[PDB]
Amino acid sequence: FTINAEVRKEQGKGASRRLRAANKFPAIIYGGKEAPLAIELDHDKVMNMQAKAEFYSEVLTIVVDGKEIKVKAQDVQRHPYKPKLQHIDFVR
């Protein structure tokens, strides 16, 4: 339950779809007094991660720029019919 994840720079409809069509998908980390952090990450890992029931309950430590952030998956966006994730909301 540890995943490496890049920081987002471009964000919108154009960037997100370009990203999604590149084996990755956008997510976001937020919570506490700190500012939110938009987080690009790989699809094929997190797709295999969600099969386990612990994923939507236990604490995940997401690795960003060296720093490991402790979070829980609050909300999630499935792709309408294809078995694949669009977006995840990581509450801190």
Partner 1 sequence: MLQPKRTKFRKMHKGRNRGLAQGTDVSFGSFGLKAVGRGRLTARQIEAARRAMTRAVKRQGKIWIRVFPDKPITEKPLAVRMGKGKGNVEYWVALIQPGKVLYEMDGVPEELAREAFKLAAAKLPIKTTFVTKTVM
Partner RNA sequence: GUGAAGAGGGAAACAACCCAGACCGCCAGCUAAGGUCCCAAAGUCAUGGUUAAGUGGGAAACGAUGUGGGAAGGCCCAGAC
Partner RNA sequence: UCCUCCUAAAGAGUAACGGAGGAGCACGAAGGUUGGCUAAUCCUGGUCGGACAUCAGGAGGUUAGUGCAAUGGCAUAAGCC
Partner RNA sequence: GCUCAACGGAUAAAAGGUACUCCGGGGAUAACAGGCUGAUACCGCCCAAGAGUUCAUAUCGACGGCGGUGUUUGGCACCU
Partner RNA sequence: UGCCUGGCGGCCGUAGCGCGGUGGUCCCACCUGACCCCAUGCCGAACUCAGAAGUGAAACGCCGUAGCGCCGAUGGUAGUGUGGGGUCUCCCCAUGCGAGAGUAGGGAACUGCCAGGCAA
Q: Which residues bind partner 1 (CB under 8 A)?
A: 50, 53, 56, 73, 76, 78, 80-81
Nearest to Mg ion of 38, 49 (CB atom): 38
Cβ 66 to RNA shortest distance, Å: 21
Nearest to Mg ion of 32, 83 (CB atom): 32
From residue 32 to residue 61, the character string flagging contacts with RNA as x (rule: CB under 7 A) and all else as - is ----x-x-----xx-xx-------------
- Spatial neighbors of 59 by CB under 8 A, at least 6 apart, are 1, 70, 71, 72
Count each helix (H run) and each strand (E run) in the chain, helices first.
Answer: 2, 7
DSSP state of 22: T
Reading the block at residue 29, the tokens are: 């980390």
